[PDB]
Design a protein around this ligand. Sequence first.
Ligand code: FES
Ligand code: FES
Ligand code: FES
Ligand code: FES
Ligand code: FES
Ligand SMILES: [Fe+2]
Ligand SMILES: [Fe+2]
Ligand SMILES: [Fe+2]
Lengths: 108, 98, 389, 389, 388
Amino acid sequence: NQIWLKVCAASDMQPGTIRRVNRVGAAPLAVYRVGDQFYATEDTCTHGIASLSEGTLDGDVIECPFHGGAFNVCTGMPASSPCTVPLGVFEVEVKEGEVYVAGEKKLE
Amino acid sequence: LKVCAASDMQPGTIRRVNRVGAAPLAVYRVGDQFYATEDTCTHGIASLSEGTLDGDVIECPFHGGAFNVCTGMPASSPCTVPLGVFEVEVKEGEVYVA
Amino acid sequence: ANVDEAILKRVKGWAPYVDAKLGFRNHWYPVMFSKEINEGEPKTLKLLGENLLVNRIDGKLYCLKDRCLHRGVQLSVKVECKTKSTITCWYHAWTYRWEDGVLCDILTNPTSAQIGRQKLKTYPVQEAKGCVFIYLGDGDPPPLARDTPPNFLDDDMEILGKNQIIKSNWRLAVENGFDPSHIYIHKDSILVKDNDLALPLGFAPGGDRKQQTRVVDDDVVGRKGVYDLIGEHGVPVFEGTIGGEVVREGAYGEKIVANDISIWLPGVLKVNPFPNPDMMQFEWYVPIDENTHYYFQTLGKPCANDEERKKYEQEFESKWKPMALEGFNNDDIWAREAMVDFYADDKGWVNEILFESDEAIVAWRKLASEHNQGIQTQAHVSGLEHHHH
Amino acid sequence: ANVDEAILKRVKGWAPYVDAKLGFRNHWYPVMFSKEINEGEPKTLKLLGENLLVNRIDGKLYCLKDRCLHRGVQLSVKVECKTKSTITCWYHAWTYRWEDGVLCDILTNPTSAQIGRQKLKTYPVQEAKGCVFIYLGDGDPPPLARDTPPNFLDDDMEILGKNQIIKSNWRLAVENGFDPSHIYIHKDSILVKDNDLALPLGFAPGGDRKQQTRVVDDDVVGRKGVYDLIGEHGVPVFEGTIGGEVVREGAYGEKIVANDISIWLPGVLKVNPFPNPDMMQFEWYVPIDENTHYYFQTLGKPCANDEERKKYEQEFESKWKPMALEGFNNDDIWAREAMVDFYADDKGWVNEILFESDEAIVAWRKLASEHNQGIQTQAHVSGLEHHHH
Amino acid sequence: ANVDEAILKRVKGWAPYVDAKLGFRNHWYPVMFSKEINEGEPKTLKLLGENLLVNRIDGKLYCLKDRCLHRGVQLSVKVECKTKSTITCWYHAWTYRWEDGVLCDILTNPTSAQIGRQKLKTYPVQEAKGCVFIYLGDGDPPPLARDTPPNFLDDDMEILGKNQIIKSNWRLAVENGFDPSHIYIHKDSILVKDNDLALPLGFAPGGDRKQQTRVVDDDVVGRKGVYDLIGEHGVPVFEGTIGGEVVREGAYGEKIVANDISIWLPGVLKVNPFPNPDMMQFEWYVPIDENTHYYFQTLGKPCANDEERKKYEQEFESKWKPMALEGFNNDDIWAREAMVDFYADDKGWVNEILFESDEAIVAWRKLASEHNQGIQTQAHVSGLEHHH
Ligand code: FES
Ligand code: FES
Ligand code: FES
Ligand code: FES
Ligand code: FES
Ligand SMILES: [Fe+2]
Ligand SMILES: [Fe+2]
Ligand SMILES: [Fe+2]
């Protein structure tokens, strides 16, 4: 259960909600539902120590609660200042109504 | 004490009331209602009867302080000290005040 | 508008006066004594925020704005008066006439299209009673007498005095001067004891509001000002009490002074008689900038011959200057300076809590609001209004 | 509204704290030592942007605003205390009671309608442990205990200290004090060597967000505070590495100091034990204005009697004040000053890049935002503004 | 936008230049001489409003922004260079590589997730002619040659200089330098008398507007500048007169200097020949902030070998530095300063009244406005802003 992490059921997350996944001995992840699509990034804002799962999802844009920085949850690319460092993006797979997230990020 | 008559002043107007060796009053008509306060602003030496009425709120000409003419409560800074209210009665369409 | 429109909206009584941070435009102001400027020795000063140059050519005073029309440098950084009647900017040698401030030569381009087509701003100057007066204004000046108090210009009146830069807005100086209750600050003046003055601590007013002052809107010479009449129906206070107990007394001397106190636009106080029954005091509070004024003090005495003049100038220098203009008015300087902080953000004009003797200050504020000849604006200072094209 | 609304919109976690540039109203603050104010000798200070006058009358302290109601002058420019219980403004003699600020007399017009109808602002004053506290707020004060750290008020605790004005905003001083990792600036302090302290370079945190601190909002006397618990599940760093090579070591002494670090509203740090294992440090960062604070340093040591207390006063005057309050905390003063430019335009509050030990500061910023008793504004300084509907 | 939109809409032709109170981003600028910065001895400077640190490591210069990513302190408050290749913030020991500015270690928390995941801003630095140039810009720099006047970088060209800080906006310094008529201020200069210089008081412009200057837009190396050609069709004034009366005379002298005057982006003036017929003056006006600039003065002279270099070194030191760089140019310094107040509120740009010789300055303003590589803003200084 390290390559793919069992998160939750696909219909157990309303379009435009965020869910935090605690991995043991590594940084937590954030899984977002934008409409019918699922995406995942590191949970930790790249600008500090804020948890992005306590931010505001506005479509495909997560707003950090600390300084109002933001990221595209699809690309992980910064969407508002002061964020400049891209989030780690984690592949999600919906296999049999079941949400799985990669235990390792795509290579930058 | 006699002041004037119900139709001697209009809705939304003020009227100074001097007194035989006494601190002048200000009489207001708010619709067809009549109220009396001190004429002197509690924030300095202004005459409120020379200010602007805005419903039940007299605005002081000096610094823009304001009072409710019913209650005497400060309604605008810099006023903090409430305005002395006087009892008002009209019998036969002749406005008397206490 | 020099002041937040939210403050001006609140001061309906006298908004133009609260706006008048830099002073009133189109008025005469004294800036120095005749003897302070010699033939062909030009002097720099700042007046209602404007850098000015003054010169004496063939005994007559001329005033240029101290700003080259070209790149906006001060001519005064390096004065080059290269012919009797001109001044040459040190930078590209644009040359102006004192007499009309016409651009008449350019030593760097004698063939320039600018020559004769540009004019440096100038201001009317006029010596009177040994004083240099500048009309900080546009168009043809009015007669000096409009902006001087009664009797200043009387032929017999010998005017002696002194001038310095005080770090307060001119309005705080005016109001302190004309303030009937402010006499409390003078209660320990060397002048009061050593010249045997009667000086109460204040006045308990009587009569009605109108009686506290006489507003002068009716002067044939066009003067505008206010007399303080608190003494006419008022009870002088010679015993100061706190909770029934006497803690201070007034001065019970023989000489009654200051029976006649008047303030005039553009900002000049007359106290008559002062500081002795044979004398009167004329003092100006002249705007230099928002934070600064000239405290231009004079004492007048009628002098019918050249013996009396010599007699006066000797007791001015030995008695009245150091006892009155300094030993009495020095307390007025730090009183003014102490009001700076409260008025500096313009909020004092809203937050001040006035009492009955401030009737005289309110009358001056209305007078000044209704009868000033213009508000000086930062626009005038940076030179974006009423120049030559 | 001390800060651009667009900045406040961005700092959703702690908007009130970022707004609190002038400090929190409705808390007690230490401003001076009891021994610096003598019977009938009024003392001036500024606190939360307000000029204050403190006086001792029959041994008890009272506090008036140093700003006359009339024309906004400081009474302190020329103090006239004419009776025991009153102060008279040097200008127009408005006279106020120390005990309740009531305008009880005016020497210049004993008939004024203002007499008994106007009130100069008062602030409560309390002495504890030789320290003068002022309640910079409105109405009935809470007990001093609410706004002091645990054990400061204990009967056994001998408090010695010093006070000075430091040029930074009070919040920079608070955050520097409670910052677990800032201990790096102290690595070469004379006191670490001369008092054989154990002092790491920093901490590798363990556990989760919640275990890094204990947020106290449930004390019996109402204190609101945060304990720094980075040490409980965290590893002290004694070997500082670059590319895996050791370039600096921490200090290896036997004396364990600073186990127990807490910050309390309105901005007071408790460090226990420090600088010695039988002592505590309590330090306040008191807001004077947006650019300035009092660094009010105290050292607590339980002494049971006259004997102990005199030895402690000797090792305070000879060792602790110079070795610790100066030799250790001098680094804290210039560290605070080094943060001024980044935070000066309020941009720092958006652009800072935090790391893990900043959890303690973040917990402080949220605690202060949620449990402060009000934001001091420029309107509290000059005069509250409100328009009718 | 550093200037009110109301003022920029009125100076339509050269709005970009009026907006550039902080200077132009994405150019090279000289800040000091090579000799002023030693191996492992970091130095501070402010450039285009940014605090920077320069260090020399195995002979090579590196430039980091002097602002810790963490709590925004200057690292130079207490420099801690703990390895040859890094600098460690004094506050919480965030440690950066000089080479690329990567946050490579944190002594106070070696387990931090920020490690390897943040980068302090770096700028390219190059030494040429014993001068230190910093590329205050983003991405790969252009060749240094683009931002130097022609001949400065020539192999035989021996460059000696003087640098100092002056309290005027850089643009007032540029305009003064290139103002053909400003030479009036130099009329009593001791260099004139002593090196026996010919110096007019001024110029009667001849020819048409376009012949007053040559706007250079076609240099192979990308240079963008203006030659002042007022000397070609115009008449040099040697007798200044007020109503036909001679009041002042020019400098009658044998030595002909300053035939060839050119201003170049980003703000360097070339005067050939000066202050002697076999030498040229290259002088930059480098923006430090709104109110301040480096007056970076150099004198160039071709020298074949060490016997001639040593010769030039000697009379720079004993003649040209004291007599020209100081004795001539000091009047430019106070002239610059005399313009601050009129231009302070950005209103001088509207309110000046130009005359014929100002065509040179008008050509620089238009050239600066269309060929500059970027406007430095307060956003670059404190941190770029943007909301979605
Ligand atoms: S921690 Fe997310 S924007 Fe700063
Ligand atoms: S006197 Fe009425 S608002 Fe001040
Ligand atoms: S600025 Fe006066 S001549 Fe150019
Ligand atoms: S200012 Fe204090 S009594 Fe007038
Ligand atoms: S400010 Fe540099 S490491 Fe914290
Ligand atoms: Fe006076
Ligand atoms: Fe510390
Ligand atoms: Fe020059």
